[PDB]
Design a protein around this ligand. Structure first.
Ligand code: OAI
Length: 297
């Protein structure tokens, strides 16, 4: 069990070493397009770039680059796009990708302001009558409604291709109480939120991959997807002991660098998967426990 390992690592106080072992072992692929001079203003952080092999290309001829990667989890059979928080000049690009990738959901795990700085552009409308137009990408975006909970909010956004007037519904799941380089308040409130996302059908394979972002698209995003894929893997096999969390994280790191940015987010991952396993292994009733613990109203 992951849970014996957890107890071992906790007793020997060795989360930092375990985590460094992963960083050291992590994949190192080229990000030549990210680092082209022309794409300087499309990257939020100098030290966070998509690998060339997994980057999402916009379907445009001017410049197809966005700081986004496709994480394709083969055994689990789930894919995610992970991306940074859109820049003031890449919000058109962001929605271009959502449209082109046919995603149903966007999971946002940061706030616009954190630690007294701006971590992400206001890339979606905050009220119904004030839609956003992205002229560069010829997209309209409209807030259709929102459901504000204590520590997260779900919004229905309408995206219109202004070229064709085709419309799509996007669900936005905005976790608002997950600090940068921090962890969720509890496994229960994390899992409640993850399970909201799943319930919505935004992860389901009849849609494009979900878009996941934090500020860099790696620390909180990586933790969210690691928990999700590990639970999915345990769910298809019904064998918790067969899931090696560290190994699943190295597999995800083949597709984007830097996933899970701190040893405590890794520790937290374990807790989330160990708790989530109760539900996956057929105690349906813990879901509603999670919901009560999380104090969402
Ligand atoms: O948003 C997160 O969860 C996360 O991974 N953030 C960050 C990861 C980063 N790696 C290197 C620089 C850097 C900055 C941030 C940052 O947000 O400043």
């Amino acid at each position: 069990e992951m849970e014996k390992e957890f107890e071992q690592i906790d007793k020997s106080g060795s989360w930092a070493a375990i985590y460094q072992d992963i960083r050291h072992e992590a994949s190192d692929f080229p990000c030549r397009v990210a680092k082209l001079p022309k794409n300087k203003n499309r990257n939020r952080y100098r030290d966070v770039s998509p690998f060339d092999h997994s980057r999402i290309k916009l379907h445009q001829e001017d410049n197809d680059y966005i700081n986004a990667s496709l994480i394709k989890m083969e055994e689990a059979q789930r894919s995610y796009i992970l991306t940074q928080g859109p820049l003031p000049n890449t919000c058109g690009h962001f929605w271009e990708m959502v449209w082109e990738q046919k995603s149903r959901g966007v999971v946002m795990l940061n706030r616009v302001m954190e630690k007294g700085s701006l971590k992400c552009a206001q890339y979606w409308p905050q009220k119904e009558e004030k839609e956003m137009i992205f002229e560069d990408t010829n997209l309209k975006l409209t807030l259709i409604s929102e459901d504000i909970k204590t520590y997260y909010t779900v919004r229905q956004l309408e995206l219109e291709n202004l070229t064709t007037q085709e419309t799509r519904e996007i669900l936005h799941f905005h976790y608002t109480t997950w600090p940068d380089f921090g962890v969720p308040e509890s496994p229960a409130s994390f899992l409640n939120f993850l399970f909201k996302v799943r319930e919505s059908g935004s992860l389901s394979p009849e849609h494009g991959p979900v878009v996941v972002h934090c500020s860099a698209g790696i620390g909180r995003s990586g933790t969210f997807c690691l928990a999700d894929t590990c639970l999915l893997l345990m769910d298809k096999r019904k064998d918790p002991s067969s899931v090696d969390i560290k190994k699943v994280l190295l597999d995800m790191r083949k597709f984007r660098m830097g996933l899970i940015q701190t040893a405590d987010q890794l520790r937290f991952s374990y807790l989330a998967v160990i708790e989530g396993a109760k539900f996956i292994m057929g105690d349906s009733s813990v879901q509603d426990q999670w919901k009560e613990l999380s104090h969402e109203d």
